[PDB]
Design an enzyme around this catalytic site. Structure first.
Site, PDB file in Angstrom:
ATOM      1  N   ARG A 125      -9.628  42.522 -16.934  1.00 34.06           N
ATOM      2  CA  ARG A 125     -10.410  41.892 -17.669  1.00 34.06           C
ATOM      3  C   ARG A 125     -11.390  41.248 -17.002  1.00 34.06           C
ATOM      4  NH1 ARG A 125     -10.554  36.491 -15.602  1.00 34.06           N
ATOM      5  NH2 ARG A 125      -8.499  35.677 -15.673  1.00 34.06           N
ATOM      6  N   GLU A 224      -8.899  30.582 -23.799  1.00 30.10           N
ATOM      7  CA  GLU A 224      -9.546  29.987 -22.522  1.00 30.10           C
ATOM      8  C   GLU A 224     -11.080  30.059 -22.550  1.00 30.10           C
ATOM      9  OE1 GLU A 224      -9.347  29.818 -17.838  1.00 30.10           O
ATOM     10  OE2 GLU A 224      -7.454  30.337 -18.853  1.00 30.10           O
ATOM     11  N   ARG A 228     -12.656  37.226 -23.990  1.00 31.72           N
ATOM     12  CA  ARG A 228     -11.884  37.898 -22.622  1.00 31.72           C
ATOM     13  C   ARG A 228     -12.036  39.276 -23.091  1.00 31.72           C
ATOM     14  NH1 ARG A 228      -8.472  34.974 -19.300  1.00 31.72           N
ATOM     15  NH2 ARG A 228      -9.635  33.011 -18.825  1.00 31.72           N
ATOM     16  N   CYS A 270     -13.129  27.894 -16.568  1.00 28.26           N
ATOM     17  CA  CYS A 270     -12.318  27.518 -15.554  1.00 28.26           C
ATOM     18  C   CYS A 270     -13.273  27.966 -14.380  1.00 28.26           C
ATOM     19  CB  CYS A 270     -10.905  28.022 -15.406  1.00 28.26           C
ATOM     20  SG  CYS A 270      -9.979  27.380 -14.126  1.00 28.26           S
ATOM     21  N   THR A 272     -12.241  29.074 -11.424  1.00 29.25           N
ATOM     22  CA  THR A 272     -11.699  30.472 -10.874  1.00 29.25           C
ATOM     23  C   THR A 272     -12.258  31.626 -11.658  1.00 29.25           C
ATOM     24  OG1 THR A 272      -9.727  30.262 -12.318  1.00 29.25           O
ATOM     25  CG2 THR A 272      -9.597  29.090 -10.321  1.00 29.25           C
ATOM     26  N   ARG A 279     -10.670  40.044 -13.335  1.00 28.92           N
ATOM     27  CA  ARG A 279      -9.183  40.023 -12.884  1.00 28.92           C
ATOM     28  C   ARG A 279      -8.492  41.239 -12.816  1.00 28.92           C
ATOM     29  NH1 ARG A 279      -3.767  38.709 -13.069  1.00 28.92           N
ATOM     30  NH2 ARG A 279      -3.195  38.386 -15.165  1.00 28.92           N
ATOM     31  N   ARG A 308       1.845  36.608  -9.968  1.00 28.60           N
ATOM     32  CA  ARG A 308       2.092  35.732 -11.401  1.00 28.60           C
ATOM     33  C   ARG A 308       3.123  36.554 -11.697  1.00 28.60           C
ATOM     34  NH1 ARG A 308      -3.535  34.672 -14.710  1.00 28.60           N
ATOM     35  NH2 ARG A 308      -4.847  34.067 -12.617  1.00 28.60           N
ATOM     36  N   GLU A 313       0.325  34.021 -15.869  1.00 23.30           N
ATOM     37  CA  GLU A 313       0.479  32.851 -15.175  1.00 23.30           C
ATOM     38  C   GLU A 313       1.439  31.706 -15.615  1.00 23.30           C
ATOM     39  OE1 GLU A 313      -3.137  31.019 -14.667  1.00 23.30           O
ATOM     40  OE2 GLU A 313      -3.285  30.592 -16.781  1.00 23.30           O
TER      41      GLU A 313
END
Ligand SMILES: Nc1ncnc2c1ncn2[C@@H]1O[C@H](COP(=O)(O)OP(=O)(O)O)[C@@H](O)[C@H]1O
Ligand SMILES: CN(CC(=O)O)C(N)N
Ligand SMILES: [Mg+2]
EC number: 2.7.3.3
Length: 356
Positions: A125, A224, A228, A270, A272, A279, A308, A313
């Site tokens: 993703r 988030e 995505r 975020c 990260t 990811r 994870r 997560e």
């Protein structure tokens, strides 16, 4: 910044300092010097250091613990974002800039686990932010809906393998939502980390999922990140999964303006997820090596991988299935990020076979 905000920051700082067993990047990097240098700053949209750190102050078990309320925050609170970004992404100097986007030569990827003894499913993703809109904490309900209409309208133009349908989260019965989360397609609700970052306001307004009938290409809207973009399927065919993501992202990019930064690459909520925002993961069973959560994590970190739980997560492994993915997303190319996952998994499979 107003005095109430200052008082809350001081209490937050003290709480972090006193939590001896907390291991978050926030605690490690929000030193007194850094804190004093930025606690009085505010972005043009009114974002303060409290907006940035509240989720990590309230959730001491956070791995990182900070989020960007708007794009300007990355620089306004750079003294705190910069060291955290450098640490998480495995080196990102003040003089570094994210490299130009480069998907790489897909034909070079290696066939994983041909016998199908280890890998259950593969997923890659990316995340994207719409230019002209801040991140979650700074959006109004009206903006959430306007963004949802914009994205669902663009996605209605996807064709062939990527053609699909949009499913608003409101609209989903309890059972419909649960099944899509249980099957690993849809984002879960009620995440304590996002809630405390003020990222779940007006839930579920403006949230939803677009997917082709096969559920191999999906787009989460307003969880988030604004978007995505996801490619996944059972088995271990990373090449096919990655090619589909490339095709989808190249197409959507031509239709929707996304925020990109000369130093941080693609912007995300975020830190990260900056840079490539990528990811790449596998659900995998390594019984001899995953005899313990920690032992598996320590092996994985040596290859720049993160472990994870099966449901993502902050969850545990079920039936010995772990989610293992590249940890780093900034300061390396898209090709390199998918390669760090592939190479690390290839090595972990070699280690599992030799273990005894
Ligand atoms: N390789 C994979 N195969 C199947 N599902 C996966 C895989 N990797 C992650 N998932 C699913 O993706 C969802 C989101 O997990 P999360 O850890 O929040 O990841 P993300 O980085 O996508 O937000 C969860 O339902 C999780 O089970
Ligand atoms: C829990 N995450 C990791 C982080 O906050 O750095 C997410 N959501 N990226
Ligand atoms: Mg997630």
């Amino acid at each position: 910044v107003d005095q109430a905000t200052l008082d809350k920051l001081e209490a937050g700082f003290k709480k972090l300092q006193e939590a001896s067993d907390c291991k978050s990047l926030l605690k490690k990097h929000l030193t007194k010097d850094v804190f004093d240098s930025i606690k009085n700053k505010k972005t043009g949209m009114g974002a303060t250091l409290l907006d940035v750190i509240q989720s990590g102050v309230e959730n001491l078990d956070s791995g990182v613990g900070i989020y960007a309320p708007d794009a300007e925050s990355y620089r306004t609170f750079g003294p705190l974002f910069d060291p955290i970004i450098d640490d998480y992404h495995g080196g990102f100097k003040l003089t570094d800039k994210h490299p130009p986007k480069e998907w790489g030569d897909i034909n070079t990827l290696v066939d994983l686990d041909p016998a199908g003894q280890f890998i259950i499913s593969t997923r890659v993703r990316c995340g994207r932010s719409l230019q002209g809109y801040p991140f979650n904490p700074c959006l109004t309900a009206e903006q959430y809906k306007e963004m949802e209409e914009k994205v669902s309208s663009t996605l209605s133009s996807m064709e062939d393998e990527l053609k699909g349908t949009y499913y608003p989260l409101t609209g989903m019965s309890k059972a419909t939502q649960q099944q899509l989360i249980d099957d690993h397609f849809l984002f879960k609700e009620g995440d304590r980390f996002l809630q405390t970052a003020n990222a779940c306001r007006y839930w579920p307004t403006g949230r939803g999922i677009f997917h082709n009938d096969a559920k191999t290409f999906l787009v989460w809207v307003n969880e988030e990140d604004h978007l995505r973009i996801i490619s996944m399927q059972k088995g271990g065919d990373l090449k096919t999964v990655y090619k589909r993501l490339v095709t989808a992202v190249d197409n959507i990019e031509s239709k929707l303006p996304f925020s990109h930064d000369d130093r941080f690459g693609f912007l995300t909520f975020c830190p990260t997820n900056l840079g490539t925002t990528m990811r790449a993961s596998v659900h995998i069973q390594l019984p001899k090596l995953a005899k313990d959560r920690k032992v598996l994590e320590d092996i994985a970190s040596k290859f720049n991988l993160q472990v994870r739980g099966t449901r993502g997560e902050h969850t545990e492994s079920e039936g010995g299935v772990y989610d293992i993915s590249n940890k780093r997303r900034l300061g390396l190319t898209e090709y390199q990020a998918v390669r760090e996952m592939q190479d690390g998994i290839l090595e972990m499979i070699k280690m599992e076979k030799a273990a005894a």
